[PDB]
Design a protein around this ligand. Sequence first.
Ligand SMILES: OCCNC(=S)NC1CCCCCC1
Length: 209
Amino acid sequence: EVETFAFQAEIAQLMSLIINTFYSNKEIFLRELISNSSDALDKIRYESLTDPSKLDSGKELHINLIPNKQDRTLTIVDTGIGMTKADLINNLGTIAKSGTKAFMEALQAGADISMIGQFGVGFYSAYLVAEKVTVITKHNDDEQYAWESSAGGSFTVRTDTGEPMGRGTKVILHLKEDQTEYLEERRIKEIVKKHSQFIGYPITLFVEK
Ligand SMILES: OCCNC(=S)NC1CCCCCC1
């Protein structure tokens, strides 16, 4: 059972901007996703200080980067606080409203796309390299859900039937045909060292066999 929702007008405008403009410095998407994962891990770790039972769904706090040349996907996995159904559908997009408007004002005040993180909307930089993004997420207070969008103004949310995650979020990037360099080991390493050398959680690169 799948529900289809329309993106808020300003978010749909940002994604169409991100997809259609010519911007060569596409590697910043990984920094933004890793920084988002760091925030999610900070939140569960902070909450667990007053409630250790919040870690019953997993004590490990880490980030895994998993390229797959066969499927042409790059997957970013964190064991952070995860996302509820209301987060996926309403609350997060409501908070991103002001940032998207301001980010688009800044895009005419000099700023470029690489500053997307300073407006709290860095996640949508995934569409610099991805034609489709799938988000599997599990929050302690909700079921496992699957969010998906190929942009174009709509996204879907459904209960996920696949492998249970425990807790956290999995961002699956279905890369565009010309963006397969982000499946390469030495390319991901160079990006992580340059942009995320100061993340307070272990970032593990899964190399393919
Ligand atoms: O970082 C930018 C703000 N977006 C966040 S925090 N999360 C996104 C995940 C996909 C579905 C929920 C809402 C959008």
